[PDB]
PDB file of N, CA and C in Angstrom:
ATOM      1  N   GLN A   1     -35.687 -73.440-127.938  1.00 18.71           N
ATOM      2  CA  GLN A   1     -36.009 -75.511-128.215  1.00 18.71           C
ATOM      3  C   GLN A   1     -36.711 -76.012-127.245  1.00 18.71           C
ATOM      4  N   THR A   2     -38.213 -75.279-127.585  1.00 16.87           N
ATOM      5  CA  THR A   2     -39.154 -76.031-127.000  1.00 16.87           C
ATOM      6  C   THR A   2     -39.610 -77.538-127.349  1.00 16.87           C
ATOM      7  N   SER A   3     -40.162 -77.349-128.723  1.00 18.07           N
ATOM      8  CA  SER A   3     -40.044 -78.264-129.669  1.00 18.07           C
ATOM      9  C   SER A   3     -40.000 -77.901-131.008  1.00 18.07           C
ATOM     10  N   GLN A   4     -40.091 -77.555-131.371  1.00 19.33           N
ATOM     11  CA  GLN A   4     -40.291 -76.647-132.777  1.00 19.33           C
ATOM     12  C   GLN A   4     -40.834 -74.983-133.282  1.00 19.33           C
ATOM     13  N   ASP A   5     -41.582 -75.747-133.959  1.00 19.85           N
ATOM     14  CA  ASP A   5     -43.219 -74.990-134.117  1.00 19.85           C
ATOM     15  C   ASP A   5     -44.316 -75.853-133.793  1.00 19.85           C
ATOM     16  N   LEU A   6     -44.407 -76.014-132.030  1.00 20.09           N
ATOM     17  CA  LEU A   6     -45.401 -76.090-131.558  1.00 20.09           C
ATOM     18  C   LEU A   6     -46.525 -75.645-131.539  1.00 20.09           C
ATOM     19  N   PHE A   7     -46.531 -74.275-130.361  1.00 17.28           N
ATOM     20  CA  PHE A   7     -47.607 -73.498-130.296  1.00 17.28           C
ATOM     21  C   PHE A   7     -46.939 -72.312-130.046  1.00 17.28           C
ATOM     22  N   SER A   8     -47.736 -71.200-130.430  1.00 20.96           N
ATOM     23  CA  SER A   8     -46.913 -69.740-130.799  1.00 20.96           C
ATOM     24  C   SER A   8     -48.514 -68.869-130.003  1.00 20.96           C
ATOM     25  N   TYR A   9     -48.128 -68.265-128.697  1.00 20.85           N
ATOM     26  CA  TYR A   9     -48.532 -67.242-128.660  1.00 20.85           C
ATOM     27  C   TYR A   9     -48.051 -65.938-128.590  1.00 20.85           C
ATOM     28  N   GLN A  10     -49.412 -65.208-128.208  1.00 21.10           N
ATOM     29  CA  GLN A  10     -48.905 -63.794-127.881  1.00 21.10           C
ATOM     30  C   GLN A  10     -49.360 -63.405-126.977  1.00 21.10           C
ATOM     31  N   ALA A  11     -48.795 -62.626-126.215  1.00 19.98           N
ATOM     32  CA  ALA A  11     -49.467 -61.932-124.535  1.00 19.98           C
ATOM     33  C   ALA A  11     -50.609 -60.869-125.234  1.00 19.98           C
ATOM     34  N   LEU A  12     -51.625 -60.367-124.941  1.00 20.04           N
ATOM     35  CA  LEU A  12     -52.818 -59.708-124.817  1.00 20.04           C
ATOM     36  C   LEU A  12     -52.390 -58.534-124.066  1.00 20.04           C
ATOM     37  N   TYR A  13     -51.247 -59.214-122.523  1.00 18.57           N
ATOM     38  CA  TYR A  13     -51.459 -58.117-121.777  1.00 18.57           C
ATOM     39  C   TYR A  13     -50.141 -57.961-121.187  1.00 18.57           C
ATOM     40  N   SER A  14     -50.080 -57.666-119.910  1.00 17.40           N
ATOM     41  CA  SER A  14     -48.619 -57.321-119.315  1.00 17.40           C
ATOM     42  C   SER A  14     -49.012 -58.016-117.665  1.00 17.40           C
ATOM     43  N   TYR A  15     -48.118 -58.816-117.483  1.00 13.19           N
ATOM     44  CA  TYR A  15     -48.545 -59.509-116.177  1.00 13.19           C
ATOM     45  C   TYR A  15     -47.331 -59.138-115.387  1.00 13.19           C
ATOM     46  N   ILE A  16     -47.236 -59.697-114.053  1.00 14.29           N
ATOM     47  CA  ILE A  16     -46.806 -59.920-113.376  1.00 14.29           C
ATOM     48  C   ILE A  16     -46.754 -60.967-112.955  1.00 14.29           C
ATOM     49  N   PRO A  17     -45.590 -61.933-112.643  1.00 15.64           N
ATOM     50  CA  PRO A  17     -45.819 -63.236-112.357  1.00 15.64           C
ATOM     51  C   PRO A  17     -46.050 -63.247-111.254  1.00 15.64           C
ATOM     52  N   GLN A  18     -46.329 -64.807-110.036  1.00 13.27           N
ATOM     53  CA  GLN A  18     -46.268 -64.425-108.583  1.00 13.27           C
ATOM     54  C   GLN A  18     -45.084 -64.560-107.855  1.00 13.27           C
ATOM     55  N   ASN A  19     -44.147 -65.625-109.379  1.00 10.80           N
ATOM     56  CA  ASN A  19     -42.448 -65.773-108.922  1.00 10.80           C
ATOM     57  C   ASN A  19     -42.142 -66.253-109.950  1.00 10.80           C
ATOM     58  N   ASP A  20     -40.487 -66.678-109.582  1.00  8.56           N
ATOM     59  CA  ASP A  20     -39.726 -66.324-110.811  1.00  8.56           C
ATOM     60  C   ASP A  20     -39.517 -67.406-111.628  1.00  8.56           C
ATOM     61  N   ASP A  21     -40.656 -68.309-111.327  1.00  9.57           N
ATOM     62  CA  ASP A  21     -40.831 -69.721-111.912  1.00  9.57           C
ATOM     63  C   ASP A  21     -41.733 -69.216-112.737  1.00  9.57           C
ATOM     64  N   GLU A  22     -42.474 -68.482-112.660  1.00  7.45           N
ATOM     65  CA  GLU A  22     -43.568 -68.239-113.780  1.00  7.45           C
ATOM     66  C   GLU A  22     -42.748 -67.126-114.779  1.00  7.45           C
ATOM     67  N   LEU A  23     -43.601 -66.939-115.775  1.00  7.17           N
ATOM     68  CA  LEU A  23     -42.889 -66.173-116.888  1.00  7.17           C
ATOM     69  C   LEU A  23     -43.683 -64.896-117.427  1.00  7.17           C
ATOM     70  N   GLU A  24     -42.180 -64.131-117.142  1.00  5.24           N
ATOM     71  CA  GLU A  24     -42.799 -62.259-117.829  1.00  5.24           C
ATOM     72  C   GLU A  24     -43.869 -62.214-118.780  1.00  5.24           C
ATOM     73  N   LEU A  25     -45.155 -62.158-118.917  1.00  6.80           N
ATOM     74  CA  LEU A  25     -46.282 -61.525-119.915  1.00  6.80           C
ATOM     75  C   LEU A  25     -45.647 -59.853-120.153  1.00  6.80           C
ATOM     76  N   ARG A  26     -45.885 -59.576-122.045  1.00  3.58           N
ATOM     77  CA  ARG A  26     -46.165 -58.081-121.672  1.00  3.58           C
ATOM     78  C   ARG A  26     -46.730 -58.204-123.260  1.00  3.58           C
ATOM     79  N   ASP A  27     -47.629 -56.967-122.322  1.00  3.26           N
ATOM     80  CA  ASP A  27     -48.335 -56.895-123.907  1.00  3.26           C
ATOM     81  C   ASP A  27     -47.328 -57.143-125.051  1.00  3.26           C
ATOM     82  N   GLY A  28     -48.213 -57.751-126.066  1.00  4.37           N
ATOM     83  CA  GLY A  28     -47.487 -57.576-127.471  1.00  4.37           C
ATOM     84  C   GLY A  28     -46.438 -58.614-127.538  1.00  4.37           C
ATOM     85  N   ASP A  29     -46.137 -58.967-126.462  1.00  2.00           N
ATOM     86  CA  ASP A  29     -44.772 -60.201-126.665  1.00  2.00           C
ATOM     87  C   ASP A  29     -45.501 -61.811-126.849  1.00  2.00           C
ATOM     88  N   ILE A  30     -44.764 -62.185-127.564  1.00  4.86           N
ATOM     89  CA  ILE A  30     -44.987 -63.156-128.124  1.00  4.86           C
ATOM     90  C   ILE A  30     -44.534 -65.200-126.633  1.00  4.86           C
ATOM     91  N   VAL A  31     -44.946 -65.867-126.357  1.00  5.78           N
ATOM     92  CA  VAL A  31     -44.826 -66.617-126.168  1.00  5.78           C
ATOM     93  C   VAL A  31     -45.407 -68.560-126.425  1.00  5.78           C
ATOM     94  N   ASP A  32     -43.775 -69.378-126.779  1.00  4.75           N
ATOM     95  CA  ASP A  32     -43.801 -70.360-126.935  1.00  4.75           C
ATOM     96  C   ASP A  32     -44.116 -71.366-126.212  1.00  4.75           C
ATOM     97  N   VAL A  33     -45.648 -71.681-126.518  1.00  6.38           N
ATOM     98  CA  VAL A  33     -45.765 -72.344-124.882  1.00  6.38           C
ATOM     99  C   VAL A  33     -45.758 -74.325-125.948  1.00  6.38           C
ATOM    100  N   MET A  34     -45.074 -75.346-125.072  1.00  4.42           N
ATOM    101  CA  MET A  34     -44.541 -76.628-124.976  1.00  4.42           C
ATOM    102  C   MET A  34     -45.527 -77.451-124.098  1.00  4.42           C
ATOM    103  N   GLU A  35     -46.091 -77.246-122.757  1.00  2.00           N
ATOM    104  CA  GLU A  35     -46.624 -78.253-121.897  1.00  2.00           C
ATOM    105  C   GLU A  35     -47.957 -77.472-121.677  1.00  2.00           C
ATOM    106  N   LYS A  36     -49.213 -78.343-121.873  1.00  2.00           N
ATOM    107  CA  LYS A  36     -50.065 -77.541-121.536  1.00  2.00           C
ATOM    108  C   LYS A  36     -50.944 -78.110-120.046  1.00  2.00           C
ATOM    109  N   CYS A  37     -51.447 -76.809-118.719  1.00  2.00           N
ATOM    110  CA  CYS A  37     -51.560 -77.747-117.857  1.00  2.00           C
ATOM    111  C   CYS A  37     -53.277 -77.599-118.002  1.00  2.00           C
ATOM    112  N   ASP A  38     -54.188 -78.450-118.115  1.00  2.00           N
ATOM    113  CA  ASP A  38     -56.136 -78.475-117.948  1.00  2.00           C
ATOM    114  C   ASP A  38     -56.554 -77.418-117.152  1.00  2.00           C
ATOM    115  N   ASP A  39     -55.476 -77.008-116.163  1.00  2.00           N
ATOM    116  CA  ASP A  39     -55.928 -76.106-114.738  1.00  2.00           C
ATOM    117  C   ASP A  39     -56.225 -74.243-116.226  1.00  2.00           C
ATOM    118  N   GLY A  40     -54.920 -74.911-117.416  1.00  2.00           N
ATOM    119  CA  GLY A  40     -55.651 -72.938-117.868  1.00  2.00           C
ATOM    120  C   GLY A  40     -54.261 -72.432-118.213  1.00  2.00           C
ATOM    121  N   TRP A  41     -53.196 -72.502-117.063  1.00  2.00           N
ATOM    122  CA  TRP A  41     -52.001 -72.442-117.412  1.00  2.00           C
ATOM    123  C   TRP A  41     -51.064 -72.867-118.150  1.00  2.00           C
ATOM    124  N   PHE A  42     -50.503 -72.276-119.098  1.00  2.00           N
ATOM    125  CA  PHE A  42     -49.276 -73.273-119.805  1.00  2.00           C
ATOM    126  C   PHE A  42     -48.130 -72.708-119.512  1.00  2.00           C
ATOM    127  N   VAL A  43     -47.266 -73.351-120.311  1.00  2.00           N
ATOM    128  CA  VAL A  43     -45.938 -74.106-119.889  1.00  2.00           C
ATOM    129  C   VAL A  43     -44.824 -73.060-120.888  1.00  2.00           C
ATOM    130  N   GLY A  44     -44.497 -72.163-121.538  1.00  3.67           N
ATOM    131  CA  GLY A  44     -43.243 -71.303-122.662  1.00  3.67           C
ATOM    132  C   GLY A  44     -42.622 -71.317-122.477  1.00  3.67           C
ATOM    133  N   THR A  45     -42.289 -69.947-123.013  1.00  2.39           N
ATOM    134  CA  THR A  45     -40.788 -69.127-123.048  1.00  2.39           C
ATOM    135  C   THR A  45     -41.062 -67.917-124.178  1.00  2.39           C
ATOM    136  N   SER A  46     -40.905 -67.246-123.374  1.00  7.88           N
ATOM    137  CA  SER A  46     -40.490 -65.753-123.777  1.00  7.88           C
ATOM    138  C   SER A  46     -39.892 -65.653-124.533  1.00  7.88           C
ATOM    139  N   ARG A  47     -40.151 -65.256-126.058  1.00  7.07           N
ATOM    140  CA  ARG A  47     -39.851 -64.340-127.197  1.00  7.07           C
ATOM    141  C   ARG A  47     -38.085 -63.677-126.937  1.00  7.07           C
ATOM    142  N   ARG A  48     -38.984 -62.948-125.772  1.00  8.13           N
ATOM    143  CA  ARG A  48     -38.205 -61.442-125.691  1.00  8.13           C
ATOM    144  C   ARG A  48     -37.030 -62.198-125.196  1.00  8.13           C
ATOM    145  N   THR A  49     -37.115 -62.074-123.753  1.00 12.25           N
ATOM    146  CA  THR A  49     -36.226 -62.741-122.868  1.00 12.25           C
ATOM    147  C   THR A  49     -35.898 -64.207-123.269  1.00 12.25           C
ATOM    148  N   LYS A  50     -36.488 -64.727-123.429  1.00 12.26           N
ATOM    149  CA  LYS A  50     -35.605 -66.402-123.876  1.00 12.26           C
ATOM    150  C   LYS A  50     -35.911 -67.003-122.253  1.00 12.26           C
ATOM    151  N   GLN A  51     -36.667 -65.974-121.706  1.00 11.46           N
ATOM    152  CA  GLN A  51     -36.711 -67.524-120.445  1.00 11.46           C
ATOM    153  C   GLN A  51     -38.229 -68.232-120.704  1.00 11.46           C
ATOM    154  N   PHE A  52     -37.861 -69.141-119.454  1.00 12.54           N
ATOM    155  CA  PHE A  52     -38.465 -70.900-119.350  1.00 12.54           C
ATOM    156  C   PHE A  52     -39.027 -70.746-117.975  1.00 12.54           C
ATOM    157  N   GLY A  53     -40.897 -71.478-118.067  1.00 13.99           N
ATOM    158  CA  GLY A  53     -40.896 -71.507-116.736  1.00 13.99           C
ATOM    159  C   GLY A  53     -42.883 -72.035-117.441  1.00 13.99           C
ATOM    160  N   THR A  54     -43.791 -71.677-116.393  1.00 17.14           N
ATOM    161  CA  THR A  54     -45.095 -70.951-116.634  1.00 17.14           C
ATOM    162  C   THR A  54     -45.973 -70.280-116.938  1.00 17.14           C
ATOM    163  N   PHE A  55     -47.128 -69.345-117.332  1.00 20.66           N
ATOM    164  CA  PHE A  55     -47.511 -68.580-117.510  1.00 20.66           C
ATOM    165  C   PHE A  55     -48.894 -68.731-117.714  1.00 20.66           C
ATOM    166  N   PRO A  56     -49.540 -68.075-117.369  1.00 21.08           N
ATOM    167  CA  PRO A  56     -50.925 -67.869-117.362  1.00 21.08           C
ATOM    168  C   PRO A  56     -51.328 -68.219-119.032  1.00 21.08           C
ATOM    169  N   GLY A  57     -51.777 -68.748-119.374  1.00 19.03           N
ATOM    170  CA  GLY A  57     -52.694 -68.844-120.811  1.00 19.03           C
ATOM    171  C   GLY A  57     -53.323 -68.092-120.930  1.00 19.03           C
ATOM    172  N   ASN A  58     -53.059 -66.901-119.930  1.00 15.98           N
ATOM    173  CA  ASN A  58     -55.180 -66.366-120.148  1.00 15.98           C
ATOM    174  C   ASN A  58     -54.758 -64.899-120.684  1.00 15.98           C
ATOM    175  N   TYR A  59     -53.807 -64.956-121.140  1.00 15.12           N
ATOM    176  CA  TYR A  59     -52.856 -63.285-121.714  1.00 15.12           C
ATOM    177  C   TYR A  59     -52.584 -63.646-122.519  1.00 15.12           C
ATOM    178  N   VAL A  60     -52.688 -64.760-123.426  1.00 15.66           N
ATOM    179  CA  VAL A  60     -51.921 -65.095-124.579  1.00 15.66           C
ATOM    180  C   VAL A  60     -53.494 -65.223-125.293  1.00 15.66           C
ATOM    181  N   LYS A  61     -52.952 -65.355-126.935  1.00 14.55           N
ATOM    182  CA  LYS A  61     -53.683 -65.645-128.472  1.00 14.55           C
ATOM    183  C   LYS A  61     -52.956 -66.829-129.029  1.00 14.55           C
ATOM    184  N   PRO A  62     -53.827 -67.636-129.767  1.00 12.51           N
ATOM    185  CA  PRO A  62     -53.283 -68.887-130.258  1.00 12.51           C
ATOM    186  C   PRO A  62     -52.659 -67.487-131.484  1.00 12.51           C
ATOM    187  N   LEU A  63     -51.463 -68.268-131.850  1.00  9.17           N
ATOM    188  CA  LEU A  63     -51.086 -67.534-133.080  1.00  9.17           C
ATOM    189  C   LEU A  63     -51.052 -68.463-134.142  1.00  9.17           C
ATOM    190  N   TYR A  64     -50.744 -68.681-135.555  1.00 10.47           N
ATOM    191  CA  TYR A  64     -49.895 -69.111-136.012  1.00 10.47           C
ATOM    192  C   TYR A  64     -48.163 -69.125-137.024  1.00 10.47           C
ATOM    193  N   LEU A  65     -47.633 -70.589-137.869  1.00 10.90           N
ATOM    194  CA  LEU A  65     -46.729 -70.888-137.405  1.00 10.90           C
ATOM    195  C   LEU A  65     -46.349 -71.600-139.065  1.00 10.90           C
TER     196      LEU A  65
END
């Protein structure tokens, strides 16, 4: 429950978060982004492990819904 069908991305790479407040990105995993930082990193939730935080939207690709 980030919003509903707001915006979902698929991970291009597997990324190791610098903090537990960041989201674990894994190659092919999907993350729904709820909030956008203009700095490029976004806030989302992991579709696989359902964790919430910030993730670098540099490792994800714009999907459709």
